[PDB]
Amino acid sequence: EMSKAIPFAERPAKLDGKIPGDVGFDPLGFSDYYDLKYLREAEIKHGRICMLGALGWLFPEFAKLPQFASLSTNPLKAATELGPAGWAQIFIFVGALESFSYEKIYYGDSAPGDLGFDPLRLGKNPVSRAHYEVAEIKNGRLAMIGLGGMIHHSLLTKQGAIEQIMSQNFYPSGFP
Amino acid sequence: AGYSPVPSPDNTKETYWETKAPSSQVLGIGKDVSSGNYIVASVVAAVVGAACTGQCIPLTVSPNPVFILGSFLLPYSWALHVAAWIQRNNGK
Amino acid sequence: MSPSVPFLKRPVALDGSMVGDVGFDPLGLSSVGDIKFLREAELKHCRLAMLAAAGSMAQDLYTFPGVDKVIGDAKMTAVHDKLVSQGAMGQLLVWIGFAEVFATMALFETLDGKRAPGDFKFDPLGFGKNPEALKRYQLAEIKNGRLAMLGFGGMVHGYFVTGKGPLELLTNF
Amino acid sequence: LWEDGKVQGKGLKAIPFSDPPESLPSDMVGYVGFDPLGFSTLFDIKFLREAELKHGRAAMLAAAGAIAQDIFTFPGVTSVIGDAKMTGAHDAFLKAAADGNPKANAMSQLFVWIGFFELVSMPALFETLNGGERAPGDFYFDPLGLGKGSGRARMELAEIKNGRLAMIGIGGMVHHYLLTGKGPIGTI
Ligand code: CLA
Ligand code: KC2
Ligand SMILES: CC1=C(C#C/C(C)=C/C=C/C(C)=C/C=C/C=C(C)/C=C/C=C(\C)C#CC2=C(C)C[C@@H](O)CC2(C)C)C(C)(C)C[C@H](O)C1
Ligand SMILES: CC1=C(C#C/C(C)=C/C=C/C(C)=C/C=C/C=C(C)/C=C/C=C(\C)C#CC2=C(C)C[C@@H](O)CC2(C)C)C(C)(C)C[C@H](O)C1
Ligand SMILES: CC1=C(C#C/C(C)=C/C=C/C(C)=C/C=C/C=C(C)/C=C/C=C(C)/C=C/C2=C(C)CCCC2(C)C)C(C)(C)C[C@H](O)C1
Ligand SMILES: CC1=CCCC(C)(C)[C@H]1/C=C/C(C)=C/C=C/C(C)=C/C=C/C=C(C)/C=C/C=C(C)/C=C/C1=C(C)CCCC1(C)C
Numbered sequence: 303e304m305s306k307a308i309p310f311a312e313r314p315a316k317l318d319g320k321i322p323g324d325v326g327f328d329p330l331g332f333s334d335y336y337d338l339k340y341l342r343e344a345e346i347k348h349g350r351i352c353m354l355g356a357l358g359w360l361f362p363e364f365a366k367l368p369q370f371a372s373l374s375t376n377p378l379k380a381a382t383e384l385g386p387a388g389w390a391q392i393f394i395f396v397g398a399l400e401s402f403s404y405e406k407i408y409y410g411d412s413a414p415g416d417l418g419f420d421p422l423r424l425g426k427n428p429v430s431r432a433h434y435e436v437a438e439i440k441n442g443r444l445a446m447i448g449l450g451g452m453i454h455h456s457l458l459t460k461q462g463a464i465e466q467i468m469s470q471n472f473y474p475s476g477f478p
Numbered sequence: 479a480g481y482s483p484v485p486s487p488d489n490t491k492e493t494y495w496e497t498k499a500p501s502s503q504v505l506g507i508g509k510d511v512s513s514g515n516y517i518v519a520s521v522v523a524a525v526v527g528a529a530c531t532g533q534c535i536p537l538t539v540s541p542n543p544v545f546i547l548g549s550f551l552l553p554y555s556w557a558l559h560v561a562a563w564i565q566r567n568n569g570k
Numbered sequence: 571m572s573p574s575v576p577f578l579k580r581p582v583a584l585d586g587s588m589v590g591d592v593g594f595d596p597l598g599l600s601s602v603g604d605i606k607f608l609r610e611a612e613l614k615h616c617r618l619a620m621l622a623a624a625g626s627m628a629q630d631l632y633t634f635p636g637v638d639k640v641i642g643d644a645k646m647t648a649v650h651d652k653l654v655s656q657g658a659m660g661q662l663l664v665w666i667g668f669a670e671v672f673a674t675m676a677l678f679e680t681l682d683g684k685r686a687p688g689d690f691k692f693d694p695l696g697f698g699k700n701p702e703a704l705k706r707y708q709l710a711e712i713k714n715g716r717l718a719m720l721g722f723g724g725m726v727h728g729y730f731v732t733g734k735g736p737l738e739l740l741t742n743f
Numbered sequence: 744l745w746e747d748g749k750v751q752g753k754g755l756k757a758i759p760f761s762d763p764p765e766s767l768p769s770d771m772v773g774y775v776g777f778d779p780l781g782f783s784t785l786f787d788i789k790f791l792r793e794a795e796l797k798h799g800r801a802a803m804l805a806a807a808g809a810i811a812q813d814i815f816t817f818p819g820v821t822s823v824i825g826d827a828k829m830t831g832a833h834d835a836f837l838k839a840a841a842d843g844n845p846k847a848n849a850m851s852q853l854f855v856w857i858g859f860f861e862l863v864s865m866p867a868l869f870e871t872l873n874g875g876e877r878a879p880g881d882f883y884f885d886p887l888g889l890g891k892g893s894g895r896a897r898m899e900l901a902e903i904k905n906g907r908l909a910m911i912g913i914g915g916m917v918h919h920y921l922l923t924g925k926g927p928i929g930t931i
């Protein structure tokens with residue numbers, strides 16, 4: 303009856319706590335209006351995107367591929383520097399990956415975010431599978447928040463995350 | 479209701495579709511082509527068209543006719559890959 | 571299946587009925603279009619290319635009186651370019667275009683099923699009255715025309731590489 | 744051999760502690776139960792076997808050719824490519840082609856003909872993936888009649904094993920050339 307996330311508010315009707323990563327947090331009630339399976343798939347995809355993005359916002363600051371050594375440790379500056387051909391190849395790779403999602407969303411039914419990618423067979427144990435599902439959701443959420451923060455910090459300081467931390471210019475000087 | 483019947487060309491079929499994919503009569507002369515054939519055609523056309531376009535991007539006063547002709551394979555590859563899908567989902 | 575390419579399936583369009591049909595269509599170009607159109611095109615190419623190969627040899631060997639003055643040392647496509655200015659190629663084009671308008675009528679008949687592909691009823695000397703002889707001759711025509719397409723390609727490209735006509739090339743190399 | 748229970752197939756497990764993926768077939772020739780990273784789950788095993796056999800054949804040819812080129816060169820190729828070994832010969836032929844020397848189009852001819860075969864054979868792969876009669880690697884090219892009947896099973900396993908070995912060996916050769924600048928025989 304009562305939401306776990308907000309103990310003083312009634313539990314959202316669609317969020318009954320059975321689905322992974324459900325703590326009854328929906329103050330604005332997106333689940334009432336929009337399809338819950340679609341919302342879950344979108345959340346999982348965003349979490350995966352942002353997990354990779356948060357990892358790659360910091361990895362070049364530690365090591366760069368020999369081809370892209372000259373590219374800036376600032377991820378935005380590196381994006382500007384990469385050039386149309388490499389970005390086009392990345393876009394084609396991403397579109398080839400997203401063709402499978404297109405097929406699974408519009409012409410198939412399955413667990414939200416299940417594209418059949420489990421090469422190492424880490425999800426066969428049900429208990430470990432449940433822990434991994436919740437962990438994926440929560441790490442994706444944390445990565446979304448962290449990567450949004452990272453993008454804005456790079457906008458402000460015009461530097462990488464580690465460089466900003468080391469130089470301790472944590473505070474803004476105004477709009478860029 | 480008194481309108482004269484509308485004349486249409488010979489061998490005009492019904493192409494309206496509410497299925498997952500059109501009926502493969504939409505592809506006309508290429509209706510019997512295989513989905514694998516369409517896939518290979520699309521990939522080859524895309525590669526050749528991109529190469530021939532790159533060979534002409536800084537257009538000179540005397541461009542190569544063969545490169546001009548082959549540059550038209552990049553738009554062609556789009557149709558081919560769309561057909562590949564259609565033919566894959568029509569059973570072939 | 572596909573006797574020609576043993577690791578590929580027999581082409582769907584090719585059922586083995588037509589002469590010189592060894593189930594050869596790896597790229598599946600018979601699926602697109604009408605096979606009658608492709609056979610008409612193949613026989614046109616066969617006859618044209620074997621005429622072309624025999625003509626390349628015969629031009630290398632003998633030349634009509636007074637053509638040496640007009641063409642100089644030109645051979646093959648050089649002769650083509652030299653005589654376009656003179657006007658010989660223009661007259662050939664006019665007459666071949668006449669014949670090809672009538673062949674257009676013939677092709678339209680073929681697509682309607684009235685005419686067998688490549689059949690223009692041209693048999694003055696009467697060879698092929700006997701059905702078995704006609705079948706043999708049809709197979710020989712197709713095979714020789716294919717061999718001649720390849721041969722003329724080889725001759726023209728050997729001229730491109732070396733600048734020598736077929737037999738003049740073969741003599742010295 | 745085709746020792747279903749000895750050299751390939753059935754309980755054969757390369758890694759005792761970790762079982763193979765369910766998708767990997769134990770009926771396939773060369774099955775030692777080895778697929779830790781689960782590539783078979785991601786990709787069709789027919790495609791993977793086609794790729795493995797193509798790679799093994801190309802690498803076997805490459806290794807045999809490296810040895811043959813080191814021990815002998817055809818009459819006259821030295822004139823056109825000086826003294827070049829392994830990938831150096833490839834680069835030398837391409838540089839002479841650019842320089843304008845004829846007799847230096849060997850790599851272009853190789854590419855043309857091999858690409859012709861691949862283009863005409865590309866359909867075969869598609870038919871195999873579409874549940875066709877053709878097996879992944881079988882091109883029905885057995886003119887001498889060498890592998891037929893009983894031998895077949897020893898021949899397929901030998902082909903796969905020698906192909907994997909040549910895949911390793913050609914990489915070793917190429918990298919040894921890149922470091923030392925020597926050939927297969929030169930290194931040893
Ligand atoms: C993982 C999350 C994360 C982390 C670790 C950081 C870290 C940082 N951010 Mg932030 N940031 C994030 C996410 C994150 N950000 C996100 C998601 C955004 C929005 C896109 C931003 C947008 C942002 C901007 C625009 C800027 C930073 C900046 C900074 C730096 C200085 C922070 C500071 O001055 O704090 C000071 C902290 C505060 C002022 C606290 C907020 C004030 C209220 C009153 C606090 C209320 C507390 C309350 C109990 C919270 C819960 C209530 C609720 C339960 C009811 C620092 C490196 C600055 C920077 O790098 O400048 C160059 C900067 O200008 N960040
Ligand atoms: C048997 C049939 C026959 C054919 C099929 C044929 C075809 C062509 C073609 C093809 C398209 C060209 C382009 C061409 C050109 C010239 N011919 Mg020729 N010709 C034939 C017969 C004769 C005869 C009998 C004579 C002759 C000549 C010339 C001269 C003169 C040049 C000059 O005198 O300056 C030139 C330029 C006269 C000559 O000079 O011969 C020594 C001459 O008497 N031709 N002739
Ligand atoms: C699917 C699957 C597989 C897999 C896999 C893979 C490859 C999984 C990869 C997972 C990854 C890369 C997860 C990354 C998560 C990153 C997070 C949560 C970052 C948070 C950053 C934060 C909070 C921050 C921050 C910060 C900000 C914003 C401001 C800064 O001043 C400070 C700070 C730095 C603290 C494999 C291939 C093994 C197969 C298997 O069968 C199953
Ligand atoms: C039908 C019909 C009739 C008719 C007719 C007529 C006029 C029929 C004419 C038929 C002809 C002219 C056939 C010619 C075939 C030529 C071939 C196959 C050439 C191959 C060359 C090769 C392979 C080559 C090559 C080469 C290459 C590539 C490299 C070169 O360096 C040299 C080299 C040579 C080595 C008649 C009149 C009987 C009446 C009948 O009532 C109806
Ligand atoms: C022609 C040309 C070129 C070229 C080129 C070529 C032809 C390059 C070829 C490169 C090749 C063939 C590299 C192979 C690497 C193999 C490795 C690392 C295997 C590792 C195996 C392991 C770790 C096994 C581990 C284990 C496993 C899995 C299983 C069992 C136990 C064990 C086996 C120990 C260039 C590049 C020079 C450029 C030039 O302009 C043009
Ligand atoms: C396309 C383009 C244009 C110009 C910029 C650039 C070149 C980088 C390029 C790309 C831009 C991109 C990818 C921008 C992306 C922006 C992102 C990811 C922004 C992220 C914003 C995230 C925000 C606020 C999160 C706010 C979270 C809050 C309150 C959380 C508060 C909470 C707390 C504290 C307790 C529990 C309850 C709740 C509500 C969860």
Ligand SMILES: CC1=CCCC(C)(C)[C@H]1/C=C/C(C)=C/C=C/C(C)=C/C=C/C=C(C)/C=C/C=C(C)/C=C/C1=C(C)CCCC1(C)C
Binds near residue numbers: 534
């Ligand atoms: C021959 C004759 C005699 C009398 C009457 C008759 C009507 C029969 C008449 C017949 C005439 C005929 C059949 C004419 C045919 C001519 C045709 C089809 C001409 C076509 C010309 C087209 C041209 C250049 C196209 C060039 C395209 C270009 C640069 C494109 C540029 C580009 C490319 C390729 C890639 C990068 C982007 C960029 C730079 C824009």
